[PDB]
């Protein structure tokens, strides 16, 4: 059983590697100048945003530059473009979770719906240090200070994610830990609206056992790391709660700020 729990971890780490192009391993090498890649372009004020804007991945009817008079609205559109691709990567990963695709498709939809943003915020910490965040697969680096200075409410979106990441990155997890942890998150039995709770909770309890063995081998000498990590799962939920409230400011105060249809589908009747 100890060998099967270790085989499950390898299955997850491998599916993680096929599913997420920018891992924590590669992001850490960028953020510490350990790569041979030239450094990401740094967006730190209005002028460097305009200078580096062509580096933000964005594909639309017109270039990101011409999406709005307001820099903050362009940042919003750029980050939304990434979120849709992030959802797609998390769904491919979820399908490799053993047992997931044998579950009632209705529950599969529910677990994706509630869990994707919690995973986005988890993995976003991999792309952060205390001063900013990698964007567009490591090609750019947008500073915390710059994001905080966008006119309200745009200036309020990233700061709680940076707050969470500095505390979360202090746990020094690696990609192999993270693969199991995001699986645990997805298979959460208390998602509102689950039809058959039991196979879900059965899979998650086995993922947790694999995670506990994983953290014990990979981080001996980090007492109670498993317990510190389970406490962040509830942090993820508050981050989602507050983020949803800021989106609701945007649809109520800004003119024509419909979300991408896939994000609309995810937030429709969420809690």
């Amino acid at each position: 059983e100890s060998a099967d729990l270790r085989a499950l971890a390898k299955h997850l780490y491998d599916s993680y590697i096929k599913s997420f192009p920018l891992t924590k391993a590669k992001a850490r090498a960028i953020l510490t100048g350990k790569t041979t890649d030239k450094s990401p372009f740094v967006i730190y004020d209005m002028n460097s945003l305009m200078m580096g804007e062509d580096k933000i991945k964005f594909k639309h009817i017109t270039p990101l530059q011409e999406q709005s008079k307001e820099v903050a609205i362009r940042i919003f559109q750029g980050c939304q473009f990434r979120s849709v691709e992030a959802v797609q990567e998390i769904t491919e990963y979820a399908k490799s979770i053993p047992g997931f695709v044998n579950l009632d498709l209705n529950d599969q939809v529910t677990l994706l719906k509630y869990g994707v943003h919690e995973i986005i915020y988890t993995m976003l910490a991999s792309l952060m240090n205390k001063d900013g965040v990698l964007i567009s697969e490591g090609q750019g680096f947008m500073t915390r200070e710059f994001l905080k200075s966008l006119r309200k409410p745009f200036g309020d979106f990233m700061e709680p994610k940076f707050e969470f990441a500095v505390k979360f990155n202090a746990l020094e997890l690696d990609d192999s830990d993270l693969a199991i942890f995001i699986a645990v998150i997805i298979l959460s039995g208390d998602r509102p609206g689950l039809l058959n709770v039991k196979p879900i909770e059965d899979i998650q309890d086995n993922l947790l056992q694999a995670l506990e063995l994983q953290l014990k081998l990979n981080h001996p000498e980090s007492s109670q790391l498993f317990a510190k990590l389970l406490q962040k799962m509830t942090d993820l939920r508050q981050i989602v709660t507050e983020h949803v409230q800021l989106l609701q400011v945007i649809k109520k105060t800004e003119t024509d700020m419909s979300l991408h249809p896939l994000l609309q589908e995810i937030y429709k009747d969420l809690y």
């Binding site: 959802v87 498709l105 209705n106 939809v109 529910t110 994706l112 719906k113 589908e265 429709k268 009747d269």
Partner: peptide
């Protein structure tokens, strides 16, 4: 919601 209200997630979910 459900399969009912999530065409896109179901699309992502199928093979």
């Amino acid at each position: 919601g459900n399969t009912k209200n999530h065409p896109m997630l179901m699309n992502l979910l199928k093979d």
